[PDB]
């Protein structure tokens, strides 16, 4: 499973690329049932919404649900990831982000790499983020907004909650890096660069939007933290190369 | 300037219709210069943001800036409006709403019930005409309609649960188009405004045209004339481009 030449060049130039229809509706169903089951596990890997009534983020479902292990090693994701990075890979981070219905606007613009570098000791942006749409993503249910091409800016040379950017910063960025929101049916995949600027739009719809993000990292690019590292469910520690898996996802207890 | 057969049907079934490029870039420019001039006029018709820094809304700019008079009577707006209502028309309300950059809102509402029960508007024999003074994109806070929700009419004198039920039958749709575009929408349609997550303000002009025979009959103290029109004299339609005019 490979990106076309144009898809590679789109990833390189714009910082993201959308692969619609990567996983079938049957596969989406299997993953959604596994997500519902995993949301019942109580732990600090599960971030509840402010009102505590729903799950906002879930870390490391692939360690608890076999379907998500299957996904994480699927040819359809690791093929494109290996194509881009040309090395053995392991899972730096696995998370499922839920944007609740009627969720309101939050200032969430950020860049992944600078946090991983300065908080977690990630040396270099030799990684790729891979999103899997567990919901249809539309203009109304809180799509990810990229600043197109903004990964070309690199990252400044130089606790996690201290990082942020100002409206004035965002304004300057949009000048050369316009807002773009990939929209597609559940089962679609998008790959995006660790140094791209992104945020999610508010979900004004009555339905939650579930977005799975796997970050694959070069086994030679393992974090070298200076202090106590964050939990393994946030930042992977096992750099054993992933074994790729061929075939459909299937229900697995 | 007539709506096509499909555009009439669209308006009836879905409650809104978009006419892209109705006014040209040069006409948008003249309108935008008039907007900036009117935004400096102090008065109760000018609604500023809570920080007093910028203007959030302007009422009745057509009474102060000649190009907005020209706009308000353009045959490109009155042709469609007269075609839909088949009567003489006057201006019920003229408003410019500016959605500041980086500004949720939860603005789901229907105009007619407000005008009926606040102002004594008898019937929904009016049409709302939006004119895009800025581009309208998915990011700068477009109006979001619940398609077809005007078919519900209006109860005799909303919540998330109600909105969730509504969207099943009346899906969200947001007209998006370049500045100068026009959209007409039904007084009974449910609409809101998505948040503006962009760095630029979005300026949307709404003219409500009303049947001269449907003038408000308020039982209470009428709202001021710059909010709710009182002069029911039929509008004279104006042909031709907009032009700068002191």
Residue numbers in the entry:
A (entry chain B): 1 to 158, 171 to 265
B (entry chain A): 1 to 103, 105 to 158, 177 to 265
The article reads:
The canonical iron-binding motif is formed by His110, Asp112 and His210 and has lost the metal in the apo structure. While the residues 159–176 were not visible in the electron density of the apo structure, this region is well defined in the ligand complexes. A third loop comprising residues 232–247 is tilted away from the active site in the ligand complexes.
Like LdoA and EcdK, GriE belongs to the 2OG-Fe(ii) oxygenase superfamily, whose members couple the decarboxylation of α-ketoglutarate to substrate oxygenation/hydroxylation via an oxo-ferryl intermediate. Recombinant GriH purified from S. lividans TK24 lacked the characteristic fluorescence of the expected F420 co-factor but nevertheless led to 4-MePro in a coupled assay with GriF, indicating that GriH can use NADH directly without requiring F420. Together, these experiments suggest that 4-MePro biosynthesis starts with the GriE-mediated hydroxylation of l-leucine, followed by oxidation with GriF. The crystal structures of the leucine hydroxylase GriE have been determined in complex with substrates and products, providing insight into the stereospecificity of the reaction.
